[PDB]
Each structure stands twice: as C-alpha cells, then as structure tokens.
Symmetry: C3
Subunit: 103 residues, 3 copies
C-alpha cells in the first residue's frame, strides 16, 4: 500500500499509523483504548479543553475573556492611564476627573 511519509503517515511494523509529533498524541484514556486510540492534541500549562473538545486558554486570577474571546487584564480593578493633556487628575466614581473642578 502506498503511503506518503512526508505527510505524517508511517509503517508501524506492517501497518499504517499516524506519525504524531509535537503538540499531538494518542488518547489512551477512551472507552475503546488501548485497542482504538483517537489522535488528539497534547496540551500543558495555560491551555484546556472545553465541553466540546476545543482548546481554550485557561485563565486564573486577574485574567478574563472580552467580548471577542480575547484574553484581557480586564476585568481587574487595575486602573488605566489618565489623559495626557497637560492637566492634573484625581479619581472619582471609577473615572478620571480634573483637579480643577474641586479647586
């Protein structure tokens, strides 16, 4: 049987196998293992699978996802830079308000 070994297949003894490299492995923890093992990705710190088997970033304290599914520091109480106009600012009701309005 003709296989293309430059395209990820090889012979394991007499038999065609996937030749899995970095980031991939065979799932030996299914119902049908070890006889039948699907190929799956191989993931470590920072990455998880969701309920549908998609890879997502695994976020802990201080990180969240925005509206676009992008990772953001949020989200956290951390305070963004005040406007760079030439005037002094103070913090009022979660916003930057000029010092003038109180002088």
């Amino acid at each position: 049987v003709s296989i293309k070994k430059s395209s990820g297949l090889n012979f394991d003894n007499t038999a065609i196998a996937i030749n899995a490299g970095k980031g991939l492995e065979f799932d030996t923890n299914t119902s049908e293992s070890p006889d039948i093992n699907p190929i799956k990705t191989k993931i470590g710190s920072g990455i998880d699978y969701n309920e549908n088997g998609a890879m997502i970033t695994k976020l802990g304290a201080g990180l969240s996802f925005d509206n676009s599914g992008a990772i953001t520091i949020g989200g956290s109480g951390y305070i963004p830079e005040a406007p760079r106009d030439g005037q002094a600012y103070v913090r009022k009701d979660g916003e930057w308000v000029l010092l003038s309005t109180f002088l």
Copy 2:
C-alpha cells in the same frame, strides 16, 4: 490494508479514516467540503489562527507580545511615592497635590 488503530486511524465502513479526538476536527467549511475535509485543530476562546493558519493566543486590553512572542502585561498605573504627601496624576506621572493648592 492493515492499520494501527491504536495510532489514530480507524475503519469507517471499509474505508480508512482519521479517528480525531480532543482538540481536533474536520474542516467542513472548505471549498472541497463536505466530500474532502482536511483535519484541523479545534479552538475556542483565547486562541485564534494567524494568516498562515498557525494557532496564536488572542490578546485584548492590557496584554501584548514581547520580542520573543511571550504574553506580557508591559499601560496600568504603578504605586505613588510613600513619603507622607498626597499625589495626583499629571502627564503620565505622579505630581504632588501641593503645586496646585
């Protein structure tokens, strides 16, 4: 044909198929689908593909890549000096309240 089923292949009514598990799927949205579907990764929040089809982390406010492509936090505000005096924020720096009183 003999196949190694313990290595990610299986038979689907006589035909050799990839047996795709977690993190992987067939792309049924290509020009040649559904009769010919390549295998691709399966990705969700926090991950995207770039122009070359490589997986990257999808970054939003406050995060960016450094020169080595690591995710970094480095424009949120550092602590003001701890000298005994009140400070306000002027031109991206901490300036004493005195200079305006």
Copy 3:
C-alpha cells in the same frame, strides 16, 4: 485502498496522505525529513512546546501559572472607593481630596 476523504485523508500521487488544515503542519525539521515528516500542531505567538512536546501558553513579564495550570497576573494600583467623592493617593492608600482643600 478505500479512504474516507471527509475524514482528513486524501491521495497524493496515488499514495495515502494526511490532508492537514488550520493549526496543523508536517515537521520538516526532523532527522529523517523530508523523507519522513511527522504531523504536528502549527503554533505562533503566545504558544510554545514544553520538553514533553505539549503546547503551553508562552508567558512573559507580569504573568505566571498558578498551581492549577491557569494564567494569572503576578505592581498596579487597585480601584478607589465608588462613593461619589474625589480621591488622591497618599502613603499607598486612597485618601479623600477634601482633607487637603
């Protein structure tokens, strides 16, 4: 040979090949390449391999993994109280503007 082309295999010059899509590529940088190229994931910025060949998020300054493998922030100032009053920063704490007016 019968192959299921809707499941990630296709013919290339009558040989069976994996039809690799987004997030996958063949590794042409092995000791047996390009005669033999394993299939691997295709990764870019924000992702790396560890020594076990698992994909990890590539973390730079200000970010670390917690003990459950999640990305977390490792020196920014917290939000001031939301009571209706203006605040200034004094001695590593939020102090009302009133006390200085």
